[PDB]
Write a protein that binds this ligand. Structure first.
Ligand SMILES: [Ca+2]
Ligand SMILES: [Ca+2]
Lengths: 57, 146
């Protein structure tokens, strides 16, 4: 879930995921990091997995 | 110049072993509305146990959609992440209390001051358009007393 590829998973990554899911073009986004659960779609479940990482890891 | 830096300040409280204490975390000198806060607060886990971390709902809205995320998985460290899930409607735009830290003072806690420290290197404060905002932190403390 390191969407900005800075080496940490934190609130910056959450903001970028929310921006992507709100339809924005997000500069400096790592596409390969978005499908966190690997089900082939990028959606609210990936956001949830990211939140759980920030909350628990 | 002073009011161009938004400040995240941990409060100062006292209590005796066995009691709980509520430590405010305050945001002040808000200028640019704040869309993201990431902060780490260190505490002495030999003396205190985190009971809860509670947002101030006057400032922190949309908690049902994970505007306020707390990580207490590492003993002695509290990581708080504030975001506006709507990316528009609920930035922090005025000064106030961000959250309260609820600590148990352990039965064995020895007397005296114990610092509650904000890591300046991991402190993140950004505006609604994902631009970093000038920011600073101020540490707090718990004094263990009779
Ligand atoms: Ca990251
Ligand atoms: Ca997915």
């Amino acid at each position: 879930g390191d969407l900005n590829d800075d080496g940490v998973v934190n609130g910056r990554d959450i903001v970028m995921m929310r921006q992507y899911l709100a339809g924005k073009t997000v500069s400096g986004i790592d596409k390969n990091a978005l499908d966190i659960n690997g089900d082939g779609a990028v959606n609210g479940d990936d956001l949830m997995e990211l939140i759980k990482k920030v909350s628990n890891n | 110049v002073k009011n161009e830096t938004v400040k995240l300040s941990v409060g100062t409280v006292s209590g005796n072993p066995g009691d709980t204490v509520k430590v405010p975390v305050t945001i002040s000198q808000v200028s640019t509305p704040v869309g993201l806060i990431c902060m780490d607060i260190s505490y002495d886990a030999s003396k205190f146990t985190v009971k809860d971390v509670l947002p101030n709902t006057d400032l922190v809205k949309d908690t049902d959609n994970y505007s306020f995320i707390v990580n207490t998985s590492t003993p002695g460290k509290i990581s708080i992440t504030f975001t506006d899930p709507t990316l528009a409607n609920y930035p922090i735009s005025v000064d106030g209390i961000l959250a309260y830290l609820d600590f148990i003072i352990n039965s064995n806690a020895t007397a005296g001051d114990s610092a509650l420290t904000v890591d300046p290197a991991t402190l993140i404060v950004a505006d609604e358009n994902d631009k970093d905002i000038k920011d600073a932190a101020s540490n707090g403390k718990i004094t263990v007393t009779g």
